[PDB]
């Protein structure tokens, strides 16, 4: 019966929580007593990439740990050089409302999308010499919110119509679709093994898919408000999230429950993006308080504050080599912090 | 520097091109056309001649970028921040309803990002409103309306009801009734945008 399954749906919900609580015999907060904290991390602005004029929404480091891709309301997806500050490309977009940008792991491809319901994939190594649209990945109905490249041929997309999708760029068809979210899917973080990926959505729920089949494997519901930011832990067994809750929490893929909540009474601004350091000891989160706080992922205490933006710190990302951390802002000034 | 001076020259050219594109794009004006469903927004853009349908038109040396953001179904709170720093909302309301339009308006004008943005409230399809008030009393839609069913006071009442949702006197709501007329909607939009750019120009120089 319709009522019986709804009752058993709740009956399923509580007993998994009981099992989830059964494995909670200890917490990381007391285990971390045996190690030393990192102290004051006084990161300083080693650069300023002042090419954008309007609100650089999202950025992504290349695999080289040398190049950026930055998307902005200006309609220009310019890609930077982290040392020479040079603008090595300036791809002009079909629509200027881009919140998604992705740098392919091989460095060949750059993709961006947004309020146009279309993922545009750009080929940088064209023999004609200029970056041009490879394919446009029509098939979503809501706004795109994040893009990540598994490899040069397949891209995983998170959208506003509560469905993540996985495409192949060889023909542009939605080879695999995902479902199981109620709110708008906002952030997406591919695992290091590229065999799984977690996404956060507006319903405060984060879940880990397998990329081989459209089946969600686990669900996490620690937060109260929409999951703005999500990022896999470097080892791949854990991940953290950020929301309008003005606090970040760290989850475990195998323990299937929250491990930490990175909060303080003095912060009330929601999180805009998050990403870990190379070793995972250090967690960087970009608050709406016009600054990025650095959180010790183990002690949960604030390792310090990074400031220098006149508006939202909308994007944040550590290099694949751990060399530095760059933070794009609504001030249009891409800082390079180390 | 090695031959990477050629790369630096290319970067300087790219920076110059970004500056030129910034100058060229800023010469246009951006207008968000948020409004109720089936409120005749397509009509007000056609008269002026799947996501954001960034339709555009140019009037008297001024180029209007008219972003109809209603094409995609999602919660406004998640994408309305992209339309911060838009010069004016082209909010439109159909009179065939209706309280959903009132709720949407009360959400828009009091929104944090739009606390300083003017609103060109269009009252659309007034002829069918006249037909309805001839056929039915307005109390079926507004129980608290005490006036008679004549055209002028009912229109004034609904316009004032929309306007009363403002909670910041520094804004302004240039309510206007089109009645499916031609070339007047463009005129009021142009007058509104002229007032807005004059106000912004004053704010820049410090006269505000």
């Amino acid at each position, epitope marked *: 019966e319709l009522d019986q399954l709804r009752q058993e749906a709740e009956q399923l919900k509580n007993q998994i929580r009981d099992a989830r609580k059964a494995c909670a015999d200890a917490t990381l907060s007391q285990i971390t007593n045996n190690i030393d904290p990192v102290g004051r991390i006084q990161m300083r602005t080693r650069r300023t990439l002042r090419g954008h004029l309007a609100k650089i929404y999202a950025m992504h480091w290349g695999t080289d740990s*040398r*190049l950026l891709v930055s998307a902005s309301q200006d309609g220009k997806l310019i890609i930077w*050089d982290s040392y*020479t500050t*040079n603008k*090595v*490309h300036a791809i002009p977009l079909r629509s200027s409302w881009v919140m998604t940008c992705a740098y392919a792991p091989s*460095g060949n491809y750059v993709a961006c999308g947004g309020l146009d319901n279309i993922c545009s994939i750009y080929n940088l*190594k064209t*023999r*004609e*010499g*200029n970056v041009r649209v490879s394919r446009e990945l029509a098939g979503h109905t809501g706004y795109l919110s994040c893009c990540r490249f598994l490899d040069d041929n397949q891209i995983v997309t998170s959208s506003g119509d509560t469905t993540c999708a996985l495409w192949d760029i060889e023909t542009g068809q939605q080879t695999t679709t995902f479902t199981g979210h109620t709110g708008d899917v906002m952030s997406l973080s591919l695992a290091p093994d590229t065999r799984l990926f977690v996404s956060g959505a507006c319903d405060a729920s984060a879940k880990l898919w397998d990329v081989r089949e459209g089946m969600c494997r686990q669900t996490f519901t620690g937060h109260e408000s929409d999951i703005n930011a999500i990022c896999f832990f470097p080892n791949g067994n854990a991940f953290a999230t950020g929301s309008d809750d003005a606090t970040c929490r760290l989850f475990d893929l195998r323990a299937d429950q929250e491990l930490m909540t990175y909060s303080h009474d003095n912060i009330i601004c929601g999180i805009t993006s998050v990403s870990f350091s190379k070793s995972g000891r250090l967690l960087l989160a970009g608050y709406d308080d016009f600054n990025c706080n650095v959180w010790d992922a183990l002690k949960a205490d604030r390792a310090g504050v990074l400031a220098g933006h006149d508006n939202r710190v909308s994007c944040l990302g550590v290099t694949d080599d751990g060399m530095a951390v760059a933070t794009g802002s609504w001030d249009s000034f891409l800082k390079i912090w180390n | 520097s*090695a*031959e*990477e001076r*050629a*790369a630096l*020259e*290319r*970067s*300087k*050219a790219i920076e110059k091109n970004l500056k030129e594109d910034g100058i060229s794009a800023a010469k246009d004006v951006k207008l968000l056309l948020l409004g109720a469903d089936n409120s005749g927004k397509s009509t007000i853009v056609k008269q002026m001649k799947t996501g954001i349908v960034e339709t555009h038109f140019t009037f008297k040396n001024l180029h209007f970028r008219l972003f109809d953001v209603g094409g995609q179904r999602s919660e406004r709170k998640k994408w309305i921040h992209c339309f911060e720093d838009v010069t004016a909302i082209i909010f439109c309301v159909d009179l065939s309803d209706m309280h959903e339009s009132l709720m949407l308006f009360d959400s828009i004008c009091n929104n944090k990002f739009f606390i300083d943005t003017s609103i060109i409230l269009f009252l659309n399809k007034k002829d069918l409103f006249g037909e309805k008030i001839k056929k039915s009393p307005l109390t079926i839609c507004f129980p608290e309306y005490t006036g008679p069913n004549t055209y002028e006071d009912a229109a004034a009442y609904i316009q004032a009801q929309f306007e009363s949702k403002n909670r910041s006197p520094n804004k302004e709501i240039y309510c206007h009734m089109t009645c499916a007329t031609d070339t007047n909607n463009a005129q009021v939009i142009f007058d509104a945008v002229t007032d807005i750019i004059i106000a912004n120009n004053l704010r820049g120089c410090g006269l505000y």
Partner: single-chain antibody
Amino acid sequence: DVQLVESGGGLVQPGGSRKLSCSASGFAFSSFGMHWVRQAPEKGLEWVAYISSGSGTIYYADTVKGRFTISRDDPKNTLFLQMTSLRSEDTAMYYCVRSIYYYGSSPFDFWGQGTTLTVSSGSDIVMTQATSSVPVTPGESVSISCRSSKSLLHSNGNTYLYWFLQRPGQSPQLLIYRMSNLASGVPDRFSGSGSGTAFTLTISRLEAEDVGVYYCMQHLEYTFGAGTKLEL
């Protein structure tokens, strides 16, 4: 479909002038530099001119400095070389090449088919080759080497030495750029390596198409060595 078609060759009386032209198609001309590398009928390659992207800067070889000029007509995608007061040494076949310079980019990807130019009778970096010819056989392995007057390793970590393959009766192509990176379309048989001032190119698992002359070029500052011909 990249094309660099050149025109304007023929016979020029000594002391005359001629406008060598390069016509480009199939690619964004304005985003690329240009060089007008030339080759004497019985000698190696020699750099001639370099026009940057958007004509920002221009360089000439000392032998044509002031004597010849280069210009690029971006709307028509055409590059011009204005050779003036030509001399006997100017009898050579000229090549029009591409170049895009940015991090990760490859200079000198494409070379035009070139045009022959003839006239009637009447503080610097140098690259030297340790051989002029080397016998080879299909399926065997070969190793070419070059040397320069000073180290090519800049402070930033790059090493701006190039390798070019010219098959007989054909225009050359890029094989290795920055001494270690394969150009597009070059089979993995070719592989360059070196350190300091002595640099080598290996052509292991030599296929029959590898026969030709291999030229090595420095690019630290504003040139091709003599080159060696592999004989099957």
